[PDB]
Design a protein around this nucleic acid. Sequence first.
RNA 1: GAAGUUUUGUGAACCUUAACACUUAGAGGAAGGAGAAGUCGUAACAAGGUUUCCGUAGGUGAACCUGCGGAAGGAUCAUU
RNA 2: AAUUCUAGCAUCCUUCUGGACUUUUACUUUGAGAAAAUUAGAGUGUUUCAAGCAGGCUUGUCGCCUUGAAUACUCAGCAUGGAAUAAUAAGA
RNA 3: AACCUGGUUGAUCCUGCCAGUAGUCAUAUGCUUGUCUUAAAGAUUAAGCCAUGCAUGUCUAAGUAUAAGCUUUUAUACGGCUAAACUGCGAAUGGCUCAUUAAAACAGUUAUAGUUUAUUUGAUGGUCUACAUGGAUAACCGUGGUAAUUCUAUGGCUAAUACCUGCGCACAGUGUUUAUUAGAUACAGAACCAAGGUGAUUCAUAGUAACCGAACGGAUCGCGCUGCGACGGAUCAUUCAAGUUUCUGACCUAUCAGCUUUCGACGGUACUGUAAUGGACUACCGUGGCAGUGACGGGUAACGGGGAAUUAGGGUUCGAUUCCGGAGAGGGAGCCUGAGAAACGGCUAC
Lengths: 185, 259, 147
Amino acid sequence: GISRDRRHKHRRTGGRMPVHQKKRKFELGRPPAMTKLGPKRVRPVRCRGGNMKYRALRLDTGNYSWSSQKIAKKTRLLGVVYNASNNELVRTNTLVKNSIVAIDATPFKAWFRSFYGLDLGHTLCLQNKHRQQGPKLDPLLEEQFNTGRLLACISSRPGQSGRADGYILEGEELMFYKRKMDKKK
Amino acid sequence: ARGPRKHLKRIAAPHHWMLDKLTGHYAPRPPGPHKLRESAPLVVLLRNRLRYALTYREVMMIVMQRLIKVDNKVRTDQCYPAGFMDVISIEKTKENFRMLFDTKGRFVPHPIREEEASYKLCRVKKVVVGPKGVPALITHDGRTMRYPHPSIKAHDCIRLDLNTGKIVDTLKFEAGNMAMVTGGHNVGRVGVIVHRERHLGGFDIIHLRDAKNNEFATRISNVFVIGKGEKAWISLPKEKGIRLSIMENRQVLLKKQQM
Amino acid sequence: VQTERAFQKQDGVSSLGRTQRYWKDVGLGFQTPRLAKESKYVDKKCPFTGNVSIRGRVIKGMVISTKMKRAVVIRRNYLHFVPKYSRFEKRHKNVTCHLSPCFEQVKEGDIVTAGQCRPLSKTIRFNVLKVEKNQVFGNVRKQFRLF
RNA sequence: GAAGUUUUGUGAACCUUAACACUUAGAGGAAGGAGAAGUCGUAACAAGGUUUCCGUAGGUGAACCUGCGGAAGGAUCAUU
RNA sequence: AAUUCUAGCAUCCUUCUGGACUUUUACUUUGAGAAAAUUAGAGUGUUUCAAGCAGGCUUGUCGCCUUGAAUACUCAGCAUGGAAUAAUAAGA
RNA sequence: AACCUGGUUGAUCCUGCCAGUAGUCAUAUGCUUGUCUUAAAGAUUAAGCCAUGCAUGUCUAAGUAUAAGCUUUUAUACGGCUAAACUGCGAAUGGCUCAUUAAAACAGUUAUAGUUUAUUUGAUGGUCUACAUGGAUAACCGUGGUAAUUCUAUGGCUAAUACCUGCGCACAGUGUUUAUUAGAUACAGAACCAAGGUGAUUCAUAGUAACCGAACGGAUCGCGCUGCGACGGAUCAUUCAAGUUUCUGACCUAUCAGCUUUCGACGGUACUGUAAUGGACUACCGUGGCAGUGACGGGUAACGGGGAAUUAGGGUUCGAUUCCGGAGAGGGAGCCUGAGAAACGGCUAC
């Protein structure tokens, strides 16, 4: 199969490396699941140890943590927007780690109304306390909410876990990727 | 290759068992509490030390009576690794054997009293926090005592009760505490601890001093604290881990044989 | 500074900390340099800044080139005994080696100590710990020092 | 969850060309040594009957010969 | 008293209560750790011997010798005492 | 035993080889051979090819018994004893060989904060019709096919520690996945307001906010309000390991001097992949890396070492072969099952 070993390929000197052994199962690799958007499917691959490792193939949804507010919501995905490594993966909408993705933002907007009551577009006391405790929201995130979208980095490896998780972009990361979206335009 | 080796060979066995060269191609192979080369299997006690059994067949006939215990627990497997500072208890004869290191560098079953054969010592490998934030020792034996004192650190011994699970008496690892060696060149030697060098990176070593004022060194993995500065929790074997010299060991031996 | 296609960010610092900088203390009797703490560079593979343990060995030697990016190559010299003739023999091995941009102006023919770590690429196993400025005249590869 | 099927990767096997390696035929040419005794000279060893020898060049049945510059391992350690 | 090793005093550090400094190594010393078999070798009448790791005492019976099967050997690497020799560094 | 004799001449003294001499716990071979103890033996060339038979199977009081079996004791669920068959575990060890292979393997020496681990040993854990859930499968009976085998179809029953489901406090556990706070330490304090563990970490662990079902929280068995142990399975150590990994080390050859790269050569960033680390692999980006101390290539009648022969010291030659690694099962390649195999007394293809 796919040999991960160093017995093939050159030495540092530029010399062929002698090989007197057949391929070994512990020097294994497997074909890469370029997982994407769509309705959910996932395949348990039996690995070394007996231990199972769940290969993503299509993922609709994911758990995405807002960092500053300290909450996380289950959310549907819309599209893959940017990738650092390969522009072909954005072309096909392929979910990988470090991949920048669009997100519904109606879970966060419903929470932000309920928690604070400043909104976007007996308790009251609890809301005020929460506001004092924690709601200004960046100027760019204010514009971003108006579309009904957010931007977020995929943090999990979908191929290993069988799960798209991530975190929402904010501050310097958000200002950075807004350059290289606008530059291609 | 391809998996674990089920046979071990004679000659490729440990030397400190003292299995002979002829009279067998293979040797008994001990996994249990202890390592392969820091233990001795229960067959070669019965046939090649205590001389109860003649054959490998007869050890099965002894052990499947459920007469042999270790640590107040019946072990049915004939090739069980019974190592350093384990108690053995046979109910018929009513005699008990604590395995210590002989001064030459061999295993020997030291016979002991009935009240003494309750307890045994376990030097702790490290201390570590388990789930629900509970603390827990782990031993050289591969026990895991839990809820200790905060007092108890790494590289020091604890008297276990065995009749019950719990600890009783701690000991500390410091200068002026009695300490046997369990491995390497100076095995079977007991002396007070003078000093330890740190060497911040790998392998701390300890210089320490025999009761006839001979000075010698070992790594900390080998060193095993018995008791306080002079005196000891345990009973010791013949010679008490002095290790007298080569010409002395000659002189005492041939003086014996003339009767 | 953001040179590259992905956002270069230091792990250790959370997104809550966006002023704060992470710096490790590598230990083994090696002091953390000041330019690691003060400066704003990233490096994944730095001992003092990122996830890499130093562990096992430590190697001194002479730097012979600094051409490739964030990495050097360090000529070790040693005598090899030849027991028939009862006499020594000068050999060498070029260890290739990581270095971090806390160390400014690492010239060719400098002395450099370097600890072992996990394999970062194919050729490099070792990572730098500390450097020393010295001049060497003519060729560097001629210069035999034993350490 | 079967047969069948789509695109990938792992990839045996066979073939074309080329190079490298190793054996191997060949009319004719031209070496070396061996025989065991032949034919033609006489080159060297004595100042060996033109002292011997070197480098290089040309010539001749063959050893060899002669030109130019060296060497004594010469046949002279030597005479206004 | 020879032969070792070591404290002082001729102007000789200190931060503390063993380690930090003395440019750095090589070198030498002691020590660690490194499987046995083989090899050298302690003990022992396998009838001798090559071998082997056994045996030896004794009308005593929970047999005894709190029985023996020692020990050495195994460039590079880790550690350490040291005043020469030789590299190497430098030139408040 | 740190050893020397014959041979150039008419004779001498040299350089110098040739021949003699001795060993092998090295093969072959000739002639001869009374005894006992120990004992190498299809390695050398053909890792060429194979008739026949054998070399891996296994049951306890304790997984499943309606043999239309046995056995005298006679039991309204089941008397025991057991063929057969299903399930479990093993078959990856051992044994044999030396064709590959020259910083490869191996040796000593590190590291695993870069990881998997059946079993053993010791720990831990109420938090999600609970007097008990479901329907098929052998052997067996009936019955065929084919020239032929460890080929097997159709029909009829019946089991589980096989297979698959699955309530539960005494919103709510543990685990997975991401975000993220604490994880202190060279000194004493004052005033004001709204404490595990390493040389060393992002380690152990606790806390916060959610995520998924794809994993645990026992529908199991024997002896005897109550004890003992058989089996199952999760996490954490432990042990038997294994995979990578640091440094240093090898025979001849220069009638082999320049190799490596757009199709990974050396490095960087970000994926992917793996049990995890890595140009291991993929995108973009830089132009490096090795070499006169022998790179690259060629030869070996080359597996490496522990060792063997050899009577000063220093050496020279051998090591297929008792042990420890390594590789292979006619040549190559692929793969299932499992803790573990790129297995060959397992399978698929040329």
